[PDB]
Amino acid sequence: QVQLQESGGDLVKPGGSLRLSCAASGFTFNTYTMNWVRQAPGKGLEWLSSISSRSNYINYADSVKGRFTISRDNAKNSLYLQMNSLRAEDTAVYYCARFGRKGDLNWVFDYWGQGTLVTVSSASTKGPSVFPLAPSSKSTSGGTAALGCLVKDYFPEPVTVSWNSGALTSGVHTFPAVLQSSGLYSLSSVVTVPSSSLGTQTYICNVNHKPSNTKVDKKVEP
């Protein structure tokens, strides 16, 4: 039950600052050296910084030294990264990563979070509009019907979509986003359900856009 979860990713202006968090559970956090590693879009992984158990051994990669500051609070089982003087090339998914047990797993990141996306841009945040893609008598393949949600005109990434709060997953596909000439993203998600259920079950697409603090639960009806 080793768990790491990052938080704080957001849009930030060039030259601006941002602070990331990582919450750990399921292991003896105050005995581990913790790390931040990032992955720029379409690039490889890049180790940034390590902080020992007592916070007295701290190392930085050249690419961030003098700009980023790592710290930790063992009482909250939490790790932090204060990023200053941000540039477009700092846009990346930022991962919390545990160094393995010293001596046994030197220079190994044996557990990682799913990461939080930081976007460095002078553009503005925009929350999505969510539209239903209603099933019709021309959207049915007989005993099954396709319905969906259109998530329009948001920035920055990411948006997450679930159906019926995760109770529906088998018939689900969420597509990657298109970047439009407006500089804004759109995506769609679709699920296939029994035609017979359209009269009885409620179908809801749950859309989250954390940068704009938007949550939408959009009922998709015939």
């Binding site: 539209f131 596909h173 990657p176």
Partner: protein
Amino acid sequence: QSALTQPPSASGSPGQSVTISCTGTSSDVGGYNYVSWYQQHPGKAPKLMIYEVSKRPSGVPDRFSGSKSGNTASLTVSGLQAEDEADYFCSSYAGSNNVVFGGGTKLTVLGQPKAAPSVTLFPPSSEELQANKATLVCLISDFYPGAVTVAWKADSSPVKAGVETTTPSKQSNNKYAASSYLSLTPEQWKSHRSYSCQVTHEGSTVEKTVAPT
């Protein structure tokens, strides 16, 4: 430019073996026996697969193995399975408390037979039209190989703009899906008798039509 050099892509068929290389120098891969490999599925946390060149954590199947020759390390996946399709990153200690990485190798598992696309076309919603916008949504699913082109028509005329189409990506069932959007004004949508989305896959086409009326 990554510190370690990996081929951008690698491929094999189920049951086959595939080897992915990772080239460093004597300041990293060749300077220590601290080479590690990580597996990353899309949107998931990277997972440790190999450490200290050839050691496997508990719970990593024995068909993953690691080796190195001089300044180059290699990950071998024997008995390839569809779930091994993923990105793989090598890593090494590099002195001065630094850990360096490769750029990643996308491993594709091949051997899938041809699969025909299904097409689902949705008209604009009432709510979007009231927002003075109109997006037609063409969803293409269940096809292999993962290459399509999408053409739009207003009545029978090929559209002159407003199309955005995604690159195909894998579904849960390991076939491909893609999507295409046609942006119109509400006036354009209401003033034609129909719009069509036509997908071309491996020389065959599937076309769906919708009408405002």
